[PDB]
Design a binder for this molecule. Structure first.
Ligand SMILES: N=C(N)c1ccc2[nH]c(-c3cccc(-c4ccccc4)c3O)nc2c1
Lengths: 246, 8
């Protein structure tokens, strides 16, 4: 995140951290995600595209730091990894960038409810906040586009939803942005999501609930002028989700 | 005492 504040998981209890194991001894961070229900986490297909070996991913719930432990954290194994069929990327955008992970604990259980672990709510069929809405995004991603390391503490920031009309303008993203994506930016192009935040949530309130409205997906640079961050429009994938989380 | 999606 560029800008933002540092937080703890008690402020984003639905955020999950996914890491990948390597032979040699290390586990490296991959992407962020969110918890929909006890056994299901949602993230972005591009996070798993280059290495779709579910056995090499670990999912942690209740985590405020990247490489050190938090008391209360739960560790999981990916039981089912579901990527999107019709996932494609171009020189920038990723289309149909949503994925589902079914988590299993080494004792055979799914997430359990604490003060650091909670589910986020889904939106209803193609229902979104109006452009203008301030939503917050969270994650362990870059702090500057030039950094080559991620922060150790969870960060968060507030961004506003912009319209398609403003985003598809030629001097922004043109037609790279489709109806199944959303754009979000800071009025003063000061904060944004960035490399390392992919898969994380974009949460806004809808009809009273804190709803997962978008998933961090792509963007040109970080906090650049007229280059909003682009998110998967979850309200338009509810059919898909449902088909697998039944 | 059980999940309540959206609650902190
Ligand atoms: N400016 C933004 N709004 C933005 C948001 C998320 C991003 N994620 C990335 C990104 C860049 C290189 C590689 C990956 C990546 C992450 C996990 C697996 C494979 C590739 C990214 O998510 N750039 C990003 C840019």
């Amino acid at each position: 995140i560029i800008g933002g504040e540092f937080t703890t998981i008690e402020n984003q209890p639905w955020f999950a951290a996914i890491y990948r194991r390597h032979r040699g001894g290390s586990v490296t961070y991959v992407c962020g995600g969110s918890l929909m229900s006890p056994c299901w986490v949602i993230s972005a297909t591009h996070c798993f595209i280059d290495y779709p070996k579910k056995e090499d991913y670990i999912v942690y719930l209740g985590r405020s730091r990247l490489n050190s432990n938090t008391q209360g954290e739960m560790k999981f194994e990916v039981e089912n990894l579901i990527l999107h069929k019709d996932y494609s990327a171009d020189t920038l955008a990723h289309h149909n960038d949503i994925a589902l992970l079914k988590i299993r604990s080494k004792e055979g259980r799914c997430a359990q409810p604490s003060r650091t672990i909670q589910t986020i709510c889904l939106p209803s069929m193609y229902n979104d906040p109006q452009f203008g809405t301030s939503c917050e995004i969270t994650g362990f991603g870059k702090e500057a586009s030039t950094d080559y390391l991620y922060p150790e503490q969870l960060k968060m920031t507030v961004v506003k939803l912009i319209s398609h009309r403003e985003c598809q303008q030629p001097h922004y993203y043109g037609s790279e942005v489709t109806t199944k994506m959303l754009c979000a930016a800071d009025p003063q192009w000061k904060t944004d999501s960035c490399q390392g935040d992919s898969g994380g949530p974009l949460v806004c309130s809808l009809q009273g609930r804190m709803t997962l409205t978008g998933i961090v997906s792509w963007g040109r640079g970080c906090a650049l002028k007229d280059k909003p961050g682009v998110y998967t429009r979850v309200s338009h994938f509810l059919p898909w989700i449902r088909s697998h989380t039944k | 005492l059980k999940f309540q999606c959206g609650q902190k």
